[PDB]
Amino acid sequence: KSLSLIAAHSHITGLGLDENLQPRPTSEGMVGQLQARRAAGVILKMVQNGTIAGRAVLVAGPPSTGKTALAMGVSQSLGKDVPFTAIAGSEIFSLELSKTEALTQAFRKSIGIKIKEETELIEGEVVEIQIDRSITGGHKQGKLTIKTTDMETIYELGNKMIDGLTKEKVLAGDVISIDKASGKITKLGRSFARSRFVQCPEGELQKRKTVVHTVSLHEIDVINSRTQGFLALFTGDTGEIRSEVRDQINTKVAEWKEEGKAEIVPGVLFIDEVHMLDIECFSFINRALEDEFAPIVMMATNRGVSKTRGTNYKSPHGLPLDLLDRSIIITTKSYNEQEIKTILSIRAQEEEVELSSDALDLLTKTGVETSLRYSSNLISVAQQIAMKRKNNTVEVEDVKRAYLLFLDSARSVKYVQENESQYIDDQGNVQISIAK
C-alpha cells in the first residue's frame, strides 16, 4: 500500500462480480455499467487463465463514465504477483528513446517470470557472544550463543564470521538473521529486554524457506544487455536495448519454461488516453501483438471521429482502421440519477463524515446538472466550510456556499462570454483598463 492518501479511485477494491460473472448492482465500491463490468470480468478471466497472448481491448465512451475506474477495478481484482503497467499517451514520446523502443519496454514490463527458490536462513536471539580475541597473528576465535523459544545452542565461529560480526555490531539480546551462503547478517531488532523492539523468534533454527521471485522480462533484458547494469532500472538510462539480447532472453525463457524451472505470468498493460499516440506508434502496436510474449493491452479513449496524430485525415475513436480491426471494443454508457447518488454516497462515506440527506440530494441534482466529478470535488470543500462553521454534518447551506465559490465548467464558460474584453483572446487583444 506504501503511503496512500485518498484519491479518486480509492474506493474501488475490484470488480463487483459473482462466481458466474454476473455483476452485482453495487459491490466492491463500484456501481453500474453492468455490461461493461461483465466484459471486464471476462477479460479478467482471460488474464487469469494465461493461455491467450496479445489481445487488445478498447474501453471507449463519454468522459467521466468510469473507464479509468474500470481499468483500476481490473488492476485491483488481479491482485499482486501479476504485472500491471499503467502508462499514458504522453509518456512514450521520449527525448532519449525512440517511440517503438519505449513501447517495447512497456510491453515487456507486463510479462513476468515466476521462479521458486529455496534458500537457507538462521534466525534467532543472541544470548551471548564471546570472542577470544588473543590475536597473536591474523587468526581470532569466538563462540556464539543463539536462542529461540525452542532452541538454545552454541556455535564455533570461523574468522569470516568474526569479521562479519565485528561490523553490524551484535550485542547480547539482539535478533539476527544469518545467511550462511553469503555471510550477510541482518539486525531485525532487539527483543523484549527494556528493563526498535521486535518479538523473540520462534523455534527451529536453521529453517529453509521458499521465496517466490517474480521478475519482468524488462529487468532480464536490462541485465543481459551487458553495458547497462541493474542501475538502469532505477536511473532510466537503459538506452536502446538491442534486439539480439531480446532474442536471447526469449530463447532462454522458452528453455526455462520447457525444462520447468521457471513459470511465465502474463500481465496487463493499460494505456490511458491512447488517442495521443502517433501513427508510427499505432503501426508498432499493430504488429507488436503477434509475438507470443505479448501482454493483454487495455486502451481507453474518449474521442469521437477525430484526426490521427501525425496524419491529416479523420478516423473513428481517434484510431486508424486496422488497429480498430485488431481489437474488441468495450462500450460504456453515462449515468442516471441513482448511479450518481450511489457514487457520491460511497465517495462521501469514505472521504469524510456523513451528510444530511437533503444535502446529498442537492449533490445529486448538481451532479446530474453539471458533472459527477464537480460534485465529488464539491464534497470535500463543503465539509471544510462545515468545519469552519463548527458543525459535524454537512448541510444544504454549506453546499450552497461551496457552489457559490467554486464554479463548474458551464458557469465559467458563460461568465467568460459576458466578460470578453477583460480577457485575452486568440489574437492577443485585451482591455486591461476598466475606464471607457
Partner: protein
Amino acid sequence: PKATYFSVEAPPSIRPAKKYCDVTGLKGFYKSPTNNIRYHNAEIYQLIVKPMAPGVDQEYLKLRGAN
C-alpha cells in the same frame, strides 16, 4: 628411533571429521551450551536434552570420548 607397537599407531586425520548428534546420530547442527550435547532439532532438544537426568551427559560424551 624406531618402535613396533607405537609406530603402527594410526595418526589423527587431517580432514575434519563429520559431526553427529549424540542421542539420535543425524547431523548435529546444534550443540547445547550447558550440556555440551549435539542434537538434531527442537523436539529432540526439549524432549531429551533438557529433561536429561544428570550424570548422563558424561556417558553421552564417553561414546565420543569427550567426558
